[PDB]
Design a protein around this nucleic acid. Structure first.
Lengths: 121, 249, 735, 716
RNA sequence: GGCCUGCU
RNA sequence: AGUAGAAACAAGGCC
């Protein structure tokens, strides 16, 4: 059924680079949209980014524009995420996700089916 | 009241009085097209050149009393200097976007009823069902086909009288439409658009487009139906065929 | 290793990759200064291709004219305009015999059209040479000025509202001793008979720009308004004739041209048995227009209009009669520079008759010396031949007659030929049992062409076996192959307005996908690039970006105000939902269900001060001059939104002595708007009648006040006020 | 008879009847009794309608003279006395407001009480026949009809008479006044029967006067009049006249076919002269990039601050000095301009917020460099005629120049891959159809192939530079403006980056015509020493501005770093066409997609993936001294993209002419290679037509050399 | 120095 | 100088 793993998590100094990764199985990966939500310590989760089934329509949060890039590869069933010039408060646990609709805009952006094994500080 | 009043004001001044007196009705068109403005030879070059100016578009004088002369930071939205050969004033493109964020609002529920052709296209496509793409050489042969899928089996002149009687019932003149199909079309499009206030000219133009049959010569392979020709770009290619069934069927 | 794209043709046939040989991604060549040199060169060239004719001096215009018709037969392969009257009459007779009833029918429909045509049809034309001001002006303006001058001189038959009556007045003007014109610097000037004759028989010459496919620039001509009605009638007859000829391809579009070419090649090759060989000639005609004598067109039309009412024959014959005596204005003039004194000067062309030749180079000096004898009142007589394809359709008729003259019934030999002719270009499929037969057939076709004043360009023509050829940038190789390089210039923002540009771009992508075999991925790339250029041109960026522009603030506040931001138009900084499946839908209707009702109402508000509609003709029609072709009009699907504004006008008239034209424009537009408010159908159907404005307006005021009281807002007080105000304007018009 | 209408009736009615006379286009001198009859009809219409008013009740108020008041309503409102268009206007308006039925013919009056029409007609004949006559003319009519006749009798259906009887006594008194006044005149020999319904006309278009004489001078040489020529044409019949002249015509008039064989075509001759120079508006192969590694997007950001930040990233500035002079200008002006640009850049760096656009001072340096006040003053010919030096503008064939090897290498390196992605495409509607998915996959493949290509970088450079230049020219027409050359890319690691090639100073740009020239001065950093190919930099001035240290295994190079400075110019058309350089991507990839589709029509399956990955099939895309070299489909993509980019960069009339006249010969050669027995009528003429387009443009000369190489490799 | 126009 | 190429730009006119 829904299977989602994480990778790349590790402590790092500020102003540095990092690349995360995910993985899927049990469904058509090239037919559903993904997101990334993060839960900060003692704060509810919020959305970070979204992406469509083409690799084309991307959006971002107001406070992280230009510093986060998102890109998927349907062939290997993964979902990368590159964050550069990381802010101090960005340290938190990051949670993969899977939308229901193929598009992104329709409906409100919130996680629906995933578990965030991956973290970062 | 007003109309005859600006008529009298025009006749007050000698030049306009002479223009109104000596000019006959037939010459109406000529003097209406009488202009010093040449038709542009390279529209793209100047559209890319004019949009870099301030006040590149034109709007009616009424804009000066609906939109403020400047926005929050002081960027000017319109100017009081009139166009070359018209009473309209040159205004900035922001006055457009401003009108779309704080301008007066109305009830656009009847635009779908007016622009019947485009909304019918949208409805037909929204409920369409695609199929597998088959790759094989397509023998595109050129044929004469009808593009308009809503033509009511009327020609240009044949439906022009219908359109006038629907929009301009008083200027019909001698003609009283005999064919009963035209009778029902007039009844329907009269009761449907009874108070629509978009414009008489645009209503007439869109009725002409919807009812009048139009035909063009195109390279087709299969299909040949009116609904299947509007999507001819999506269903037929050089070496691929995309099975499609519009929402109508 | 050195990269060389041309070597790609060693594996891909030339026609399958011909798009690579079309450098239509750069700026096309433009002319910079005067076109007088080209005009003089064309006049001299036209006169020297017919040098062996006979000279005469017109008793009316006093200009020297050269008649080469029935002149000595050519003895060389150089271009020659010595057409033979009997040969062309025989060709037309054979054309009639092969297509019985063609001329009689075409004349019948032409007679119907001529006797029911109106004057306003002349307004539907591009720039025309107004003789009242001696300059090019819009067709409507020139027509209005000429009508005003005629009415001031006493020629008021055009008040009947009939084009035939306007032409009657035009001809009657030719027999007047003294006409009067107006000039601003207003001064009333008197024109004698000869001066007015030359002003009515003259043409204005300009230089053609944006012409791709040749190193040298050319000159083109624009006629006056007195001769355009006869030209309209003659071209109507020629179009009606050509529509009955399958060998013609001028009155049709491109796809019809391709279909007819395929049909003719299949007919010629398929009917040919194993013994007969087939060869295709991809022929271009050198100096097509310069070698077509108007007298021969007169002969063709008078043969066509045999056994017809004499008035029809006269009205159709007036046009070639005037072309045979046509004059050409030399042009803008010549600009000189003096580097020693560091100055520049601009001498008008009219001084070329008397100005000394010390300022001109050797080439221009000789051109002026050769053209001076033909200079009459600042314009050169150009009797020998047409200037620039004014009689396109009659030339196509002559070419089709030549093509049909080899139907194997007139050849009287084993060889035969057919093909397709479109003025200045042709494809000729010739079949014969042996190479000797093909050679004889092509030789006889060339010889017959030289007897009709038509020359074949040997340098731009070649013959191969049938199955591969070219015709008007259409390359046939066992089936037509798409090019897509001819339509590349049309992939940008058209330049009409925001909504119009969006719709035109998407529709052009769609059409080039349907016709020019544009690929799906290529179409998607074109859509992306067009959207990028559109946003960068109209300063309408996605709104979620930080691209500061003159319009990025209002767009951003509209973005933050809207809740369903997916419904915003690209013009207002919204996302683009277009794709290969959505190329046939207007943007407004594609985003209708996603727009917020507030933004939707603000956008499509009839009371918006930006939307302006003038006539039914200019509602959703955009004139895009295609590359390598004549000006064309396109229907584009668009919804009347606040983005349908019309752009600013030139505004340079304010610094010219012709400044009063703007006041007249404003007053005419005010009167027209008042009439439209009085007569709502003024735009959709142009009103007809013989009454004057104020009569109709006041009388309709009477009646409408009446009836709108019998049910409506009016009241007795207001109704009587309107009645007595109508009486007031009546007595005002009295005095 | 017309004397009667001169005498009795008032003006108003006589001119109303005269305009009604003009209405249907018949003349009054031939038959006037109709005029009198219908004017009497119109008179009875008035006299029946006027003097009859109504108030809020029914029961019309009848007053001999309308008193001043709002109570001037007319009982009967007239139909006739108007044009047909307005008569039908009133008919339709009454029908639409009164809800009544529309008659098919013209009524005469409308009334409120009975809410209907009146068709008044007073005929000479007695009423009791004319009434039912007009009644059977009108179909199923509810409009009441009422007619009088001269004897004095009245009649109507329903026995209905709609108003006062004293008015009708008025009518018949008027009637007998008419009658026993003609009695004094004496017209009844025709008055009863004078109109019978004649409608006929012949259209007359007569050639006469001067226009006839012109017709007599537009005939064949041996004709004297248009009458005689038309008679001859009508009497003409085909009797084998083309054959006679064909036999008599000289046999030297022929179209003999010259066979086209492998040994026939000769290589195109190239012009000889001084080597060809560089014409581009910016450096293509010798560009250098100063970067910041910022996260901003292409359009996002402010130019001046980005340029200053990029330039501060480089250390090693030296006092600039001349290395290679312009050879025709004043190099010290270029040096001073460079130092001025640096000084004013620092001046911006100091102040509060970097301006979005900066204007520079108009010093003599840039006054000369931008060509200011050099256009000769325009004067009148009558004041300058004795000046010996006064002559035409120099109008001759351009200078001849021979091809050089630098353009070949520039094109070679314009098709090479790079370490960056120079295209960031926009968004499209999410793909819904499988064909859309195929298109998207194809597009992604081509973008992966072409994004890392110097051609895309040149496209972006040209687009940005021309857009900025056009916008500045249209906005700051008068004052010189500074614009840093900026291009934003994305590294392999994914980090976005900005690049600053140099600066452009735009000058006065009062551009009226599409050909008017705006002059600017361009400065660009580079490392390529100009002492190795000087002939390529004829119009450039190159200084030494610093030293650069790029990490290399040979210690560290510490190369020199020069500044290419030149005066260039453009025009509105050139700017517009250079800002649409992205359609080169289209051209190229449309060609490649056409190849893919054509090959996939053979094998019934999409063939894109194996073409782009397996790379088994290859096309001839260049020649090495060993022989012809073939490359994968991606290399063909890049080569075609570079060809289109160079077409857009080095565009000129020479290119168009050569392209056309060489496509002709290419088609002929293809026909030869296809075994189609091609033939030509004058091949030397075609060769001369091709060779006249090759004058001095490096791009067209390179194309001609490529064509010669293709001919040499072909024809085997 | 002040003001006008940028296809007329 | 420069752009460009069979003639032009390198502002125009009006006070």
């Amino acid at each position: 059924q829904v299977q989602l793993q994480e990778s790349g998590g590790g402590m790092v100094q500020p102003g540095g680079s990092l690349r995360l990764s995910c993985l899927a199985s049990g469904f058509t990966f090239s037919n559903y949209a993904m997101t990334w939500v993060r839960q900060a310590p003692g704060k509810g989760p919020e959305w970070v980014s979204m992406v469509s089934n083409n690799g084309a329509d991307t959006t971002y949060t107001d406070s992280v524009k230009g510093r986060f890039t998102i890109s998927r590869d349907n062939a290997k069933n993964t979902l990368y995420l590159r964050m550069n010039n990381v802010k101090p408060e960005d340290s938190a646990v990051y949670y993969c996700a899977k939308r229901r609709y193929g598009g992104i805009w329709t409906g409100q952006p919130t996680d629906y089916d995933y578990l965030g094994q991956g973290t970062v500080t | 009241m007003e109309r005859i009043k600006e008529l009298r004001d025009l006749m007050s001044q000698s030049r306009t009085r002479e223009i109104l007196t000596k000019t006959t009705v037939d010459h109406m068109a000529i003097i209406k097209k009488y202009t010093s403005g040449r038709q542009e030879k390279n529209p793209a070059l100047r559209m890319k050149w004019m949009m870099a100016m301030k006040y590149p578009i034109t709007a009616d004088k009424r804009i000066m009393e609906m939109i403020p002369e400047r926005n929050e930071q002081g960027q000017t939205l319109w100017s009081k200097t009139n166009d070359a050969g018209s009473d309209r004033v040159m205004v900035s493109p922001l006055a457009v976007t401003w009108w779309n964020r704080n301008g007066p609002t109305t009830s656009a529920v009847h635009y779908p009823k007016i622009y019947k052709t485009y909304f019918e296209k949208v409805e037909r496509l929204k409920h369409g069902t695609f199929g597998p793409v088959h790759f094989r050489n397509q023998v595109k042969i050129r044929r004469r086909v009808d593009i308009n899928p809503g033509h009511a089996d009327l020609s240009a002149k044949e439906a022009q009288d219908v359109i006038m009687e629907v929009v301009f019932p008083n200027e019909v003149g001698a003609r009283i439409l005999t064919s009963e199909s035209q009778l029902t079309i007039t009844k329907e499009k009269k009761e449907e658009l009874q108070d629509c206030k978009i414009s008489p000219l645009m209503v007439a133009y869109m009725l002409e487009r919807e009812l009048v049959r139009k035909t063009r010569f195109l390279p087709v392979a299969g299909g040949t139906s009116s609904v299947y020709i509007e999507v001819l770009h999506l269903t037929q290619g050089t070496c691929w065929e995309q099975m499609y069934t519009p929402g109508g069927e | 290793m050195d990269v060389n794209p041309t070597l790609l043709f060693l594996k891909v046939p030339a026609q399958n990759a011909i798009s690579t040989t079309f450098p239509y991604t750069g700026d096309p060549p433009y002319s910079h200064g005067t076109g007088t040199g080209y005009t003089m060169d064309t006049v001299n060239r036209t006169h020297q291709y017919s040098e062996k004719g006979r000279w005469t001096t017109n008793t009316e215009t006093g200009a020297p004219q050269l008649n080469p018709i029935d002149g000595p037969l050519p003895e060389d392969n150089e271009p020659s305009g010595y057409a033979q009257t009997d040969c062309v009459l025989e060709a037309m007779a054979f054309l009639e015999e092969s297509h019985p009833g063609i001329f009689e029918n075409s004349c019948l429909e032409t007679m119907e059209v001529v006797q029911q045509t109106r004057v306003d049809k002349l307004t539907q034309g591009r720039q025309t040479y107004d003789w009242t001001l001696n300059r090019n002006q819009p067709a409507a303006t020139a027509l209005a000025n000429t009508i005003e001058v005629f009415r001031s001189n006493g020629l008021t038959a055009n008040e009947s509202g009939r084009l035939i009556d306007f032409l009657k007045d035009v001809m009657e003007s030719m027999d007047k001793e003294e006409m009067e014109i107006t000039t601003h610097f207003k001064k009333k000037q008197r024109l004698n008979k000869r001066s007015y004759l030359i002003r009515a028989l003259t043409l204005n010459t300009m230089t053609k720009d944006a012409e791709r496919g040749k190193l040298k620039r050319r000159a083109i001509a624009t006629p006056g308004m007195q001769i355009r009605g006869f030209v309209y009638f003659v071209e109507t007859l020629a179009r009606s004739i050509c529509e009955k000829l399958e060998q013609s391809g001028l009155p049709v579009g491109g796809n019809e041209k391709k279909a007819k070419l395929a049909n003719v090649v299949r007919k010629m090759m398929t009917n040919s048995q194993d013994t007969e060989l087939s060869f295709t000639i991809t022929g271009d005609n050198t100096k097509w227009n310069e070698n077509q004598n108007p007298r021969m067109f007169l002969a063709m039309i008078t043969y066509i209009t045999r056994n017809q009412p004499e008035w029809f024959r006269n009205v159709l014959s007036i046009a070639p009669i005037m072309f045979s005596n046509k004059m050409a204005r030399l042009g803008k003039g010549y600009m000189f520079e003096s580097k020693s004194m560091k100055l520049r000067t601009q001498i008008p062309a009219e001084m070329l008759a008397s100005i000394d030749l010390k300022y001109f180079n050797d080439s221009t000096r000789k051109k002026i010396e050769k053209i001076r004898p033909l200079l009459i009142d600042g314009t050169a007589s150009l009797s020998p031949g047409m200037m620039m394809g004014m009689f396109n359709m009659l030339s196509t008729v002559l070419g089709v007659s030549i093509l049909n003259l080899g139907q194997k019934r007139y050849t009287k030999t084993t060889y035969w030929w057919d093909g397709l002719q479109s003025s200045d270009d042709f494809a000729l499929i010739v079949n014969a049992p042996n190479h000797e037969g093909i050679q004889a057939g092509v030789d006889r076709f060339y010889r017959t062409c030289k007897l009709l004043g038509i020359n074949m360009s040997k340098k731009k023509s070649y013959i191969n076996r049938t199955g591969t050829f070219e015709f008007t940038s259409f390359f046939y190789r066992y089936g037509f192959v798409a090019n897509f390089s001819m339509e590349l210039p049309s992939f940008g923002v058209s330049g009409i307005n925001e909504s119009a540009d969006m719709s035109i771009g998407v529709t052009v992508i769609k059409n080039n996908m349907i016709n020019n075999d544009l690929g799906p991925a290529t179409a998607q790339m074109a859509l992306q690039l067009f959207i990028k250029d559109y946003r960068y041109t109209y300063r309408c960026h996605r709104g979620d970006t930080q691209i500061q522009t003159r319009r990025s603030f209002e767009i951003k506040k509209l973005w933050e105000q809207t809740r369903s931001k997916a419904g915003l138009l690209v013009s207002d900084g919204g996302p683009n939902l277009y794709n290969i499946r959505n190329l046939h839908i207007p943007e407004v209707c594609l985003k209708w269900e996603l727009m917020d009702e507030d933004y939707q109402g603000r956008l499509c508000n009839p009371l918006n001060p930006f939307v302006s509609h003038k006539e039914i003709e200019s509602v959703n029609n955009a004139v895009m001059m295609p590359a390598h072709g004549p000006a064309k009009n396109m229907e584009y699907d668009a919804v009347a939104t606040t983005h349908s504004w019309i752009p600013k006008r030139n505004r340079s008239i304010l610094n010219t002595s012709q400044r009063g034209i703007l006041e007249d424009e404003q007053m005419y537009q005010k009167c027209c708007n008042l009439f439209e408010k009085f007569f709502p159908s003024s735009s959709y159907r142009r009103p007809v009648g013989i009454s004057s404005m104020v009569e109709a307006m006041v009388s309709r005021a009477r009646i409408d006040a009446r009836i709108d009281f019998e049910s409506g807002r009016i009241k007795k007080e207001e109704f009587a006020e309107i009645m007595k105000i109508c009486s007031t304007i009546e007595e005002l018009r009295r005095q | 008879m017309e004397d009667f209408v001169r005498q009795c009736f008032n003006p108003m009615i006589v001119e109303l009847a005269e305009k009604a006379m003009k209405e249907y286009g018949e003349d009054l001198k031939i038959e006037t009794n109709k005029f009198a009859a219908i004017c009497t009809h119109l008179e009875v219409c008035f006299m029946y309608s006027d003097f009859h008013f109504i108030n809020e009740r029914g029961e019309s108020i009848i007053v001999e003279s309308g008193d001043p008041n709002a109570l001037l309503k007319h009982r009967f409102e007239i139909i006739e006395g108007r044009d047909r268009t307005m008569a039908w206007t009133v008919v339709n308006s009454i029908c639409n407001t009164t809800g009544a039925e529309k008659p098919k013919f013209l009524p005469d009056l409308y009334d409120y009480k009975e809410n209907r029409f009146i068709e008044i007609g007073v005929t000479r004949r007695e009423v009791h026949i004319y009434y039912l006559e007009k009644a059977n003319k009108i179909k199923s009519e509810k409009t009441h009809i009422h007619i009088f006749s001269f004897t004095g009798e009245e009649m109507a259906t329903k026995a209905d008479y709609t108003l006062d009887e004293e008015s009708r006594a008025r009518i018949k008194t008027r009637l007998f006044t008419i009658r026993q006044e003609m009695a004094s005149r004496g017209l009844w020999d025709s008055f009863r029967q004078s109109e019978r319904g004649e409608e006929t006309i012949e259209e007359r278009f007569e050639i006469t006067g001067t226009m006839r004489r012109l017709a007599d001078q537009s005939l064949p040489p041996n004709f004297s009049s248009l009458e005689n020529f038309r008679a001859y044409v009508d009497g003409f019949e085909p009797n084998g006249y083309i054959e006679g002249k064909l036999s008599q015509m000289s046999k030297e008039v022929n179209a003999r076919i010259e066979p086209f064989l492998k040994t026939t075509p000769r290589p195109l001759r190239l012009p000889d002269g001084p080597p060809c120079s560089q014409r581009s508006k910016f450096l293509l192969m010798d560009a250098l990039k100063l970067s910041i590694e910022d996260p901003s997007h292409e359009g996002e950001g402010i130019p001046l601050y980005d340029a200053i930040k990029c330039m501060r990233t480089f250390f090693g500035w030296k006092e600039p000095n001349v290395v290679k002079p312009h050879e025709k200008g004043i190099n010290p002006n270029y040096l001073l301009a460079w130092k001025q640009v640096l000084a004013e850049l620092q001046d911006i760096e100091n102040e509060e917020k970097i301006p979005k656009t900066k204007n520079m001072k108009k010093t003599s340096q840039l006054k000369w460099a931008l060509g200011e006040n050099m256009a000769p003053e325009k004067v009148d010919f009558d004041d300058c005629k004795d000046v010996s030096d006064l002559k035409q503008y120099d109008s001759d064939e351009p200078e001849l120049r021979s091809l050089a090897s630098w353009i070949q290498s520039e094109f070679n390196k314009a098709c090479e891959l790079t370490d960056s992605s120079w295209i960031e495409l926009d968004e499209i509607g999410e793909d819904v159809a499988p064909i859309e998915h195929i298109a998207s996959m194809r597009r992604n493949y081509f973008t992966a192939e072409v994004s890392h290509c110097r051609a895309t970088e040149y496209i972006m450079k040209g687009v940005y530079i021309n857009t900025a230049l056009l916008n500045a020219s249209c906005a700051a027409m008068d004052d010189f403006q500074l614009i840093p050359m900026i291009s934003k890319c994305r590294t392999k690691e994914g980090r976005r980056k900005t690049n600053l090639y140099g600066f452009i100073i735009k000058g006065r740009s009062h551009l009226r015509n599409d050909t008017d020239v705006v002059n600017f001065v361009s400065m660009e950093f580079s490392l390529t020493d100009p002492r190795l190919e000087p002939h390529k930099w004829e119009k450039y001035c190159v200084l030494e501005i610093g030293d650069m240290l790029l990490r290399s295994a040979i210690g560290q190079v510490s190369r020199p770093m020069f500044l290419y400075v030149r005066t260039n110019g453009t025009s509105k058309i050139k700017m517009k066409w250079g800002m649409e350089m992205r359609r080169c991507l289209l051209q190229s990839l449309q060609q490649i997609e056409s190849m893919i589709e054509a090959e996939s029509s053979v094998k019934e399956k999409d063939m894109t993936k194996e073409f782009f990955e397996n790379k088994s099939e290859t096309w001839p895309i260049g020649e090495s001294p060993k022989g012809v070299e073939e490359g994968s489909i991606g290399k063909v993509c890049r080569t075609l993209l570079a060809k289109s980019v160079f077409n857009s960069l080095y565009a000129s009339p020479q290119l168009e002419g050569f392209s056309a006249e060489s496509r002709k010969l290419l088609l002929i050669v293809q026909a030869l290679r296809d075994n189609l027995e091609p033939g030509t009528f004058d091949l030397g003429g075609l060769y001369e037509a091709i060779e006249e387009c090759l004058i001095n443009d490096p791009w067209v000369l390179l194309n001609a050399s490529w064509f010669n190489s293709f001919l040499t490799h072909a024809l085997r």
